[PDB]
Nucleic acid binder design. Structure first.
Lengths: 58, 101, 90, 65
RNA sequence: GAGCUGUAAGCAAGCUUUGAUCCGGAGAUUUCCGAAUGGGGAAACCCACCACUCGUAAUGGAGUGGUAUCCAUAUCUGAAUUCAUAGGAUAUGAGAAGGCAGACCCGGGGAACUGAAACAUCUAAGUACCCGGAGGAAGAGAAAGCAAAUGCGAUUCCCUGAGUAGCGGCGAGCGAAACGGGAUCAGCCCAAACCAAGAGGCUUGCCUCUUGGGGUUGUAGGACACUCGAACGAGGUAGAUGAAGAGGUCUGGAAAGGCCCGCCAUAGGAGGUAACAGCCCUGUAGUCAAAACUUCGUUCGAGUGGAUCCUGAGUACGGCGGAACACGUGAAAUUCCGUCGGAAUCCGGGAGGACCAUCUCCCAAGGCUAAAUACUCCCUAGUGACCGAUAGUGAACCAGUACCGUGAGGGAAAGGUGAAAAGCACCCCGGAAGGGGAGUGAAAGAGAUCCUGAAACCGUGUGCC
RNA sequence: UGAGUAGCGAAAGAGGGGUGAGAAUCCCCUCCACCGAAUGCCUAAGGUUUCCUGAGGAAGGCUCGUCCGCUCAGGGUUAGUCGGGACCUAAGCCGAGGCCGAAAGGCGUAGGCGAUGGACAACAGGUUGAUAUUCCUGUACCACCUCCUCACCAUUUGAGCA
């Protein structure tokens, strides 16, 4: 899972409950599957929601 | 080494002291020098292949080069060695003398 | 490749001496050499006609000396059966 | 020896004298296998000879190249 | 510049001053595996296609060279749907891969034992380990800084600050920075404004894209109108030259030892020389040397004005959930991550440890940047109040071997004749082995674990019982 | 140390000759005994020369050993038809493209690998110390090629080929 325009990728962190207990988790960006111009040719590549917010092509 | 095959030399140490001899051997692999009439070992000899003999062979044995210096060809005493060039090829020139070899 | 290298040396045994009487000859050949280029090599260089060629290869015998345990060379032996009224070999 | 394989003709005559002394070397291996050869230094010098000539030919061709 | 075809003892032989063996520089070959790359595969093999050669009456057979994928460029074609793209086909590419020093540096991922005398917060520790990447150093770097004064001016690193301020079941423990002193010292290039052309859409500049001006700036600056691929020295890789006693005498098997005498020394470093050598040799100090490659040092633009424009947008920042800052959410600044929201434009912004006003400093959201720095698989030359073979590397010796394990892996023991083999001719016993003699040596008790040969242990005669 | 003790690993030999320095243990002969849906004869996996010949007996041989599966020096394995390749594919594995995944990677299309399977042409006599559907002998068979031979077809209302 990658994002083509921006360097968003799944990152690893640690969720902490009450009593401050620490365990390891992961953090996912809001990727979406959609049909995009990357070259002049249409393709379907992933894209983050923050990247799609900034008004790109379809 | 400073000595060569075929040289008239003079020996310093060992049982054989101060006796003349000629050189017919050289061992640069081990700095080892066989002089005539020195280290007179008596080798026990078995028959050699088809040679039908059995006896003690009395023959030369080689000595170390550090115990041998050559002599001055002019004055005859044992002298030290130097190196010098003479019209192309270098020559072995003994010390305290201008003569070569 | 060169035909003067494809067969290395002949081998002289009692079996070999038996087969030269009945006109089959023994040779040690190159490892990569097969049944046919030894044949074309031998009529190219001997002026002889050979009918059948048999091939077999020996692996090295294990052999010990001193304390080392080496392996002798892998060999390929060739048998050449000359035709009738073909010339002889040294 | 060393000079002659350059000083003689360019390529041609080398080839038949190559297989001439390859024939000779072949004869030495044959007679050694049957156990009759005497000059065992020949079996060193002929194969050296070949390298001598091979190298000159090969350099020559790369020098021409 | 003279013996040499290694270890290693060969005579079946042969090469050498018509200059060998050897040493240094550059070349050539280099089978087959191996990223392995024609296809396959159980490493070290098998089976091919095309082009060109050998050979055959041909078939079979042989040689040489290409023939993997991806990526970049170029060309052609460009289905379905024949606008056009996917895709396909051809050619060009000292292009990539894989290995590596178990070191050093960045990132991504990332424990537990342990401590807390239990234990979860914490610690161990962002350690080990795994992954990716390059470098010989890497990162970092020219201020939206440090700081609070007649102020300093890129980073980095060392001493100091200081076990201080702090953090912390305020427990266990963790733990700074700036000022000061040193090493080193390099500062630069874009984007935007505007102009010029060409680049067409036309909705006549709202945008092309490549050049140049256009420029990198905070007591603001810039646009804007006024201003001029050689030759040479030193190294490196082979080397050469290089002083002075067989001095006498004694013991000794052998003098380098003892006594009595000399000499050199820019050389009394060291090693070998039958025992402890400056003058025996190799050498050493100096002094030279390069046909060929290789590494270092000398040649081949500004000031003034300030109408107007620009000064890095889904960016700073905020919420939420985390991470890093010594700092565990706490009075929590600051940096980064993910989601969501989301400005300002010079009268503008950011920081000064909550936050707000004043004051001071600075201009982010664009890049590049050597030296001080870290580290040794290596190579050269040396050094040791480092070991002397149960030590010192596992490995002084054919060791990562033998051996064990299916495999990952584990992993030993084993140095010493003599100065020289001069290593036992010859005789007797015997099948030999082994001995006894003879011989070599200074030693045979020195004869193949062969310097010395302790003890355990085992024998043989015996004085006393 | 035990201690010259335990053990010496299922089994019928005996006698005469011969070698030898040495003989219960080696060799020759005559009887006897044992196995015989096996302790016989082929041949896998596996081992890798242990196979044969000639020497030797320090170590291996639970004793001896003149002996060998030990040492040393030689020698021995021949295939168009046998087994496997240049034939096919199962299970499974790999995998251009691709699809997923913090990274390594995981899955998988076309395709390919993969016998234990399917197809597929020599056999019965002789031969030495060692090989034998491999060597010799006679009779065969399978695939492919044409310097050649005869028979026939049509060389585009085309024979033939697939």
């Amino acid at each position: 899972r990658k994002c083509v325009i921006t360097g968003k990728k799944t990152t690893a962190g640690n969720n902490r409950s009450h009593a401050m207990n620490a365990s390891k988790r992961t953090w996912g960006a809001n990727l979406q599957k959609v049909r995009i111009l990357v070259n002049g040719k249409p393709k379907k590549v992933y894209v983050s929601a923050r990247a799609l917010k900034s008004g790109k092509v379809e | 080494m400073h000595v060569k095959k075929g040289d008239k030399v003079m020996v310093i140490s060992g049982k054989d002291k101060g006796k003349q001899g000629t050189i017919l051997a050289a061992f640069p692999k081990k700095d080892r020098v066989l002089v005539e009439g020195v280290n007179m070992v008596k080798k026990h000899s078995k028959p050699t292949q088809a040679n039908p003999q059995g006896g003690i062979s009395n023959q030369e044995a080689p000595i170390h080069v550090s115990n041998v210096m050559p002599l001055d060809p002019k004055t005859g005493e044992v002298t030290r060695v130097g190196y010098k060039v003479e019209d192309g090829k270098k020559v072995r020139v003994a010390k305290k003398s201008g003569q070569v070899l | 490749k060169d035909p003067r290298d494809v067969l290395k040396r002949p081998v002289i045994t009692e079996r070999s001496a038996d087969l030269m009487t009945e006109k089959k000859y023994t040779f040690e050949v190159d490892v990569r050499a097969n049944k046919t280029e030894v044949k074309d090599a031998v009529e190219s260089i001997f002026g002889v006609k050979v009918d059948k060629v048999n091939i077999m290869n020996y692996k090295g015998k294990s052999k010990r000396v001193g304390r080392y345990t080496g392996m002798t060379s892998r060999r390929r032996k060739a048998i050449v059966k000359l035709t009738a009224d073909s010339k002889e070999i040294e | 020896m060393k000079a002659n394989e350059i000083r003689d003709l360019t390529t041609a005559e080398i080839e038949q004298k190559v297989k001439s002394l390859k024939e000779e070397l072949f004869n030495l291996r044959f007679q050694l296998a049957t156990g009759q050869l005497e000059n065992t230094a020949r079996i060193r010098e002929v194969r050296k000879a070949i390298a001598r000539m091979k190298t000159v030919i090969r350099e020559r061709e790369i020098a021409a190249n």
